[PDB]
Design a protein around this ligand. Structure first.
Ligand code: ADP
Ligand code: ADP
Ligand code: ADP
Ligand code: ZN
Ligand code: ZN
Lengths: 716, 474, 279
């Protein structure tokens, strides 16, 4: 109907749109009609309709300036509606762009605008752009202000105020707010959650009146720093079109005593007075830290004022409060109950596709060279948040500048445009930037996604089926459990010799049910025990709840399970709701050393043995670790697998690594002497000559004895 | 409104806002840096720097500079907010409708709509800085009123505002004429029905606006004669005594509340009326020195919700009692001791008014500069409401005053006699002149380049009738 | 009405005058009721706060409370989650002496809460609020309200397929077709997460001498120990012998000691408080 296709208009007029005759008949439009056109980002404009049969039915033509104003590209769909109630502009104040007006003498108004508006009746709306082509020059302008507001028709008698200081162009670009969803990638799940939690209360309030419920108000986002929380909040606010009222934490806390409270009160009052609105309290942890932190009165009055304001807004006002904190435990506990920030959202490091999306988003203004393999960079960047990727791009560009610096005269302040053209980033530059990268997200526990199937784990079919029936069935067929009245099992404990690949089994289990994975290695547990860490077990389980369905993994639990930490872990495990799809998987090498309390029913009761890989399993592991390596044609690893009886997966990795080391040594020696694109069987034999088992016979016998004891304990 | 409010205000405010007022400073001898690059002592001094004001013997900070300080203190550009109005006039009246679950104040109140304790403190910014009397005659006639009758007086003072270079971003109110409302003056005080005063002043101010003036304060005389041979007067208003007793403070606060100053930086659009009150008391010697004052903004918003009344002690203002429709929270007045520590003293029975005032600097135009006085007059046709004295406006005085000049010519002499404020008001009161004829009369009498307009005026039949009836009348 | 944080957020020297005027006004317009919500924030434990203001406020509160005790028909009510958090000096004669304990509701209480909240929602015919009450254990009223809100949100989310978000308005038929299904409530139960049980709370139990097996002599001994003192204190007074205080169960794990304790509590119709090992 009104979803007209966008196309480039022949005319250069800034307020003229050509439409097809068929569409004109459908919409009952006519030549010269002023119509309101809406595109994307809620952008709107006023265009004079002109019949044009050249366009295909259902298509319209607009010029470059109108498309730029509408923030839309050719081929999109725009909605055109009648605008019969547009009045003549009583007074329009307009200012030019400085860079455009450079080199112009005389009165700009007479030169450009006076012929442009006389006998033109061009509709003008605030925030629009119009370009005047006079003589040999072309100058753009802005619709700074219109009376009556917000738009009106510039008639012959309309007064135009061109007086005013030039407007810098840098503000429009470098201040690129109004960022849409297209500027956020790799976090579609959390973006969808925030959208479904914010848009519907504001865009369609009548829904909840029809259902007769009070929609949730508070929202609390948290995650590692640099994951785009502020960017997501800004994008949601801009798309929703609400009265955004960004509030910073450090900014509020930097005011004199007795002023931060006033700022908070004024902010909340203005947000209420202009409903609907969206208040974003950035870095709330800087306003209301944990109780054990600063006890100063100035640090308590602000928290009390914030609590009072949060409790006082419960009314028919459309106010939504969004807060961002690095960790959930930093905020005062009082801010996590009903009527307050009761809804939580967790941001985690992206996967390969997310990193690719981030790279493409950032690497659209770069003058990249042809040899770009963004997929390769995404594969080789693990654990990078968006900020790290942006820094990587900046460093790569700086490296390219350094490389091209040879053709630059530093003393001279002007650089040849030819040299500027030659600038282009290359894959080597990105590799160097990675070499100079300093990721820091992984220093703490963070939600992440894994993509391991039942192919990187060789053999162990019975274990695979046991894990499937333990985990996958509850998630996919909970209705059956309800029908039979059986509560799903919470977690399991993997025990066995080191290197059996327990982490791989955990990752596979997480992948099958499409669940986020959280890892807690031994050093993290020790740091928590000493109390010098930035996070605590309660925080870990809160994040697990927030990012459900999650899978928490503990490694070498025997170090702490040899106790305050174990008590906290038991309390948290008992606390969690059974229905929540949260699974705690523990890995250890000395099960008998584990505290018996951990093994009680209702806890990590199920005990699963992870045996060493067998011949076929070893062959599969070797083939898997060598899939992306150039091997000798006609080479067979069956003999090597047969000869490696009793070796663990880590041992096979070590053998392959030594073979690769010998291959690279030989290749480098040959190149220096100057061939060997692959690895010959002699390298594998040399590597195997140094093979050494990582498991002693006594320990394996002890594991077998423990397994036999466990089987006897269940054999009657 | 996604930014600063949109409204049109006085030209003085606009031009002052355009400036920034930075006071440049040169290389200090303590700097350690090359020629270019300023470290900490060579930076420009902001206009609100209290050290400069107190070092130059200026007690207040030229309100516009205070606005600049407030704007700089917050409201980061391009981000950090969506604009918060920096100026808000305090209001103490209890919110009649809060309803967290309670009923209105008369029979229910919560802790969210309870007027919090008020901390009285001397204001730091004075709206209008310098009150300037164009000519000595304007106030000499006023004091001559007291001389002749012996009773006190009271009169509004019309005028216009302008810049004041002598102070950073300062404003001066130049007073052009004085109009005396009908009042019943007496030895110890004066009285006047408010209804008549406001009804008369509405039309008088309409005519003044037509003339280009504006009501910019009230002036009253508190003078007593001494026993010396000549005319000497006691100085009853000094540091020890009361500068302004309770009642005058109350009246000034009411007047300010009823003459709001339109501003672009408040939610309501008004803040701290630019109204100046002048009192004549006499300096430490027997002279007849004048003074100026202005009640602070808190007192402006304090009297509106009653809460204050006069006290038999001249220097202290009584505090009323709680009752329905009038909730009065505890009032703490904050002072400073000799040890540099602020002390809060509860003063419920009564507290001094020194914390509700700001003092302005009176003066007269330099006697060696261009003369831009609207009216070269005020020694002539007697002023309006001097019925108590012999002065009385009527046909006979016009015949004696403005007949021989018109009957012959000499337009140069005529112009000054036609540029008298009260003369214009009286002739307009007669209603003899037609509207447009009166408009061109005022345009000739209050503007330069008046030859053609004056000739046209004397041409119009209205003036012919005026002169004819004047001559015919005794 | 006086709130804790609301008073605490005032400038220094103004959080006490507000209390003074509050009590004075309450006295003036008697009869009056004063609800000092979140009294802990304005009177925490003595060791928690050492600042001068945090003691001025408490002293002012105590003085006003002591001065209030008079013929005036004014009653003071205070609320605090932790009974020990309040300053101990506030729990003496002439002050907050009478104490009331609020415990998590039982199945009947949960049913009543659900009915009270679920009176306006467009509930579908296939709703079994009794089943939801039975399943929800340890859910405080706030948790139940959140559960209902989440279920309604899930219902609207499911219906979103036919809802065009771009249009400001929606077809009236779709708006009128909203209906909450039992599956939505089950999903909300899955999502919800109660937190009351994290700390010790008071709750009732309904275990009789039929969900356990055997132990007949033990049951008789427990009855003689607990029931008779509760049901027939008159005969105990007649013989002048005070009842025994406590009992200690010992034996192999998994024999059902918790069920015996719950049954004992039910027989005397007394509330049950528990303290697990981790606590
Ligand atoms: N999709 C994205 N996810 C994460 N970061 C992104 C994304 N797109 C861009 N970025 C960049 O990552 C950074 C995110 O900053 P952010 O962590 O939100 O700031 P804050 O510290 O205020 O939370 C910015 O430099 C932003 O440009
Ligand atoms: N099917 C498999 N069985 C055992 N190990 C494997 C298998 N597939 C891969 N591996 C390798 O085993 C290693 C396990 O490392 P590590 O975590 O230190 O020991 P574990 O996983 O046994 O705790 C991984 O680096 C991985 O490359
Ligand atoms: N008569 C009984 N004897 C033993 N166990 C029972 C009996 N009745 C119920 N149970 C079961 O005992 C479990 C709780 O055992 P209990 O002894 O109360 O706690 P614990 O095992 O910690 O001592 C419950 O899951 C319940 O199903
Ligand atoms: Zn310097
Ligand atoms: Zn109220």
């Amino acid at each position: 109907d009104n979803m007209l296709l966008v196309d480039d208009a022949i005319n250069d007029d800034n307020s003229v749109i050509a439409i097809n005759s068929n569409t004109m008949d459908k919409l009952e439009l006519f030549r010269g009609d002023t119509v309101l056109v809406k595109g994307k980002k809620r952008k709107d404009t006023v265009l004079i309709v002109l019949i044009d049969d050249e366009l295909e039915d259902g298509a319209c033509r607009i010029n470059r300036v109108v498309r730029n104003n509408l923030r839309i590209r050719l081929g999109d769909l725009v909605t055109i509606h009648p605008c019969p109630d547009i009045k003549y502009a009583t007074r329009i104040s307009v200012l030019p762009i400085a860079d455009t007006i450079e080199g112009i003498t005389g009165n700009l108004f007479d030169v450009f605008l006076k012929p442009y508006f006389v006998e033109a009746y061009r509709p003008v709306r605030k925030g629009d752009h119009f370009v005047v082509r006079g003589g040999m020059r072309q100058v753009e302008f802005k619709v700074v202000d219109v009376e009556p507001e917000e738009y009106a028709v510039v008639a012959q008698d309309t007064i135009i105020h061109w007086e005013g200081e030039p407007i810098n162009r840098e503000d429009e670009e470098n201040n690129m707010n109004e960022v849409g969803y297209d500027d956020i990638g790799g976090c579609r799940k959390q973006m969808a959650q925030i959208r479904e939690m914010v848009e519907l209360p504001l865009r369609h309030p009548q829904l909840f009146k029809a259902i007769g419920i009070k929609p949730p108000r508070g929202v609390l986002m948290y995650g590692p720093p640099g994951t785009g929380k502020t960017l997501m909040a800004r994008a949601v606010a801009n798309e929703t079109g609400a009265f955004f009222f960004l509030i910073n934490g450090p900014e509020v806390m930097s005011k004199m005593a007795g002023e931060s409270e006033s700022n908070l009160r004024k902010a909340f009052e203005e947000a209420e007075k202009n409903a609907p609105a969206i208040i974003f309290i950035d870095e709330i942890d800087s306003i209301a830290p944990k109780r054990d932190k600063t006890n100063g009165e100035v640090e308590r009055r602000v928290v009390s004022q914030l609590l009072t304001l949060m409790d006082g807004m419960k009314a028919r006002s459309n106010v939504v409060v969004i807060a961002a904190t690095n960790r959930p435990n930093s905020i005062d506990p009082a801010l996590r109950r009903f009527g307050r920030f009761d809804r939580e959202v967790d941001i985690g490091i992206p996967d390969a596709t997310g990193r690719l999306e981030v790279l493409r988003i950032h690497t659209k203004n770069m003058k990249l060279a042809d040899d770009v393999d963004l997929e390769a960079l995404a594969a080789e960047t693990h654990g990078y948040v968006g900020a790290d990727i942006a820094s990587l791009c900046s460093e790569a560009a700086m490296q390219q500048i350094r490389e091209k610096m040879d053709l630059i005269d530093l003393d001279e302040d002007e650089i040849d445009a030819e040299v500027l053209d030659s600038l282009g980033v290359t894959m080597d530059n990105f590799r160097f930037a990675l070499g100079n990268s300093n990721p820091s997200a992984l220093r703490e526990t963070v939600v992440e996604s894994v993509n391991v199937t039942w192919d990187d784990v060789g053999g162990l079919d019975e274990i695979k089926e046991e894990l499937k029936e333990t985990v996958e069935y509850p998630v996919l067929h909970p209705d059956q459990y309800t029908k039979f009245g059986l509560s799903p099992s919470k977690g399991v404990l993997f025990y066995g010799p080191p290197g059996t690949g327990k982490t791989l089994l955990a990752k596979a289990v997480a992948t099958e049910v499409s669940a986020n994975f959280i890892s807690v290695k031994g050093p993290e547990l020790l740091s928590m025990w000493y109390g010098e860490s930035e996070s605590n077990i309660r925080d870990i389980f809160d994040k697990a709840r927030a990012a459900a369905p999650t899978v928490v993994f503990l490694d070498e639990l025997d170090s702490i399970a040899k106790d305050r930490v174990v008590n906290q872990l038991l309390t948290e495990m008992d606390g969690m709701n059974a229905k929540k799809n949260v699974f705690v998987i523990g890995a250890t090498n000395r099960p008998d050393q584990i505290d018996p309390a951990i093994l009680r029913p209702g806890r990590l009761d199920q005990l699963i043995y992870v045996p060493l890989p067998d011949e076929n399993a070893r062959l599969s592991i070797l083939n898997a670790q060598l899939r992306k390596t150039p091997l000798e044609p006609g080479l067979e690893l069956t003999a090597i697998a047969k000869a490696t009886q009793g070796f663990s997966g880590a041992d096979l990795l070590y053998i392959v690594q030594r073979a690769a080391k010998y291959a690279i040594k030989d290749s480098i020696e040959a190149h220096r002497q100057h061939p060997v694109p692959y690895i010959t069987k002699e390298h594998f034999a040399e590597a195997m000559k140094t093979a050494k088992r990582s498991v002693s016979d006594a320990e394996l016998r002890r594991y077998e004895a423990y397994s036999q004891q466990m089987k006897a304990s269940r054999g009657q | 409104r996604y930014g600063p409010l949109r409204i049109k205000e006085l030209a003085v405010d606009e031009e002052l806002e355009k400036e920034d007022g930075l006071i440049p400073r040169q290389k200090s001898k303590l700097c350690k840096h090359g020629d270019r690059g300023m470290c900490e002592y060579c930076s420009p001094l902001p206009p609100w720097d209290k050290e400069y004001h107190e070092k130059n013997k200026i007690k207040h900070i030229s309100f516009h500079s205070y606005l600049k300080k407030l704007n700089e203190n917050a409201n980061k550009k391009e981000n950090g907010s969506s604009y918060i109005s920096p100026l808000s006039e305090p209001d103490f009246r209890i919110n009649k409708r809060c309803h967290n679950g309670h009923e209105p104040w008369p029979r229910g109140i919560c802790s969210k709509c309870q007027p919090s304790a008020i901390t009285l403190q001397q204001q730091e910014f004075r709206m209008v800085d310098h009150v300037e009397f164009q000519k000595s005659e304007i106030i000499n006639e006023f004091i001559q009123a007291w001389r002749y009758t012996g009773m006190q007086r009271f009169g509004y003072m019309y005028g216009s505002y302008s810049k004041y270079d002598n102070t950073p971003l300062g404003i001066k109110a130049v007073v052009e004429a004085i109009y005396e409302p009908p009042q019943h003056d007496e030895q110890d005080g004066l009285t006047m029905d408010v209804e008549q005063v406001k009804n008369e002043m509405l039309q008088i101010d309409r005519q003044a606006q037509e003339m280009g003036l504006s009501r910019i304060g009230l002036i009253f005389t508190d003078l007593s004669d001494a026993g010396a041979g000549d005319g000497s007067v006691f100085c009853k208003r000094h540091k020890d005594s009361f500068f302004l007793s309770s009642l005058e403070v109350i009246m000034a606060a009411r007047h300010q509340t009823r003459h709001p100053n339109v501003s672009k930086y408040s939610e309501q659009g008004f803040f701290s009326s630019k109204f100046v009150t002048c009192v004549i008391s006499g300096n430490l010697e027997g002279e007849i020195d004048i003074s100026s004052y202005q009640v602070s903004t808190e007192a402006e918003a304090l009297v509106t919700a009653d809460m204050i009344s006069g006290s038999t002690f001249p220097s202290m203002a009584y505090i009323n009692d709680t009752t329905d429709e009038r909730y009065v929270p505890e009032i703490f007045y904050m002072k400073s001791n000799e040890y540099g520590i602020t002390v809060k003293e509860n003063a419920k029975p009564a507290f001094p008014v020194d914390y509700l005032l700001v003092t302005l600097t009176h003066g007269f135009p330099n006697t060696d500069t261009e003369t831009n006085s609207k009216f070269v007059s005020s020694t002539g046709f007697p002023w309006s409401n001097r019925q108590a004295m012999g002065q009385s406006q009527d046909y006979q005085e016009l015949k004696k005053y403005l007949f021989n000049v018109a009957s012959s010519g000499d337009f140069n002499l005529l112009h000054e006699k036609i540029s008298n404020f009260h003369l214009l008001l009286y002739i307009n009161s007669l209603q003899i002149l037609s509207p447009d004829e009166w408009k061109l009369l005022i345009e000739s009498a209050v503007k330069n380049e008046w030859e053609e307009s004056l000739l046209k005026l004397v041409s119009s039949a209205g003036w012919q009738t005026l002169v004819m009836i004047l001559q015919e009348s005794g």
